[PDB]
Amino acid sequence: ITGRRLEADIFIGVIYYQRLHHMVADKMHARSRGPVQVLTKQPTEGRAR
Amino acid sequence: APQFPIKFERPTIYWELRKDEEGNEYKHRMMPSEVRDRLEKIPDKDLPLLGLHPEKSRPEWMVLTVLPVPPVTMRP
């Protein structure tokens, strides 16, 4: 941003990095209203349902 | 009236240690009908001494004669 030299020598290298399956696309869940359990009349369990 | 010891066997078996004519001790199985008949004779005044309520929990009601089947909503 500033374009100035950093006051410290920054350690930089090549590191093998792995992307894991824990993605936010499969983890975001939002429920307002919907299906309920027949026995307890309470909200169901799971993002799929 | 003489009394005899009562032995409790799990889960719901009751044994009465009665005495024979010759003095021998034998276990007599008390059927639930006999137990309920014995429990029916207890007056309401002695129920607080036994930890029971005369109007809420009679001793004879602990022996089931009518079984209430739950509604279909309870067992969908």
Say how far apart CA B59 and CA B11 lie, in whole Å.
18
Token pair recorded at residue A39: 């026995």
* Cβ-based neighbours of B60, under 8 Å, separated by 6 or more: B36, B39, B40, B42
Torsion of CA B46, B48, B52, B57, to 10 degrees: 80
* Cβ-based neighbours of B52, under 8 Å, separated by 6 or more: B58, B59
* Cβ-based neighbours of B53, under 8 Å, separated by 6 or more: B47
Q: Which of residues 24-43 of A touch B (CB under 8 A)?
A: 38-39
CA distances for B10 relative to B23, B31, B57, angstroms: 27, 14, 23
B67/chain A closest Cα distance in angstroms: 22
* Cβ-based neighbours of A45, under 8 Å, separated by 6 or more: none
Kindly report the number of other CB atoms within 10 A of residue A26's CB atom: 9
Say how far apart CA B63 and CA B30 lie, in whole Å.
13
Resolution of the PDB structure in angstroms? 2.2
Question: Which residue shows structure tokens 């008949």?
Answer: B37
A34/chain B closest Cα distance in angstroms: 20
**Angle value at C-alpha B10, between B27 and B44, nearest 5 degrees:** 80
Q: What is the 3-state secondary structure (H, E, C) of chain A?
A: CCCCCCCCCCCCCCCCCCCCCCCCCCCCCCCCCCCECCCCCCECCCCCC
CA distances for B23 relative to B4, B28, B63, angstroms: 13, 15, 32
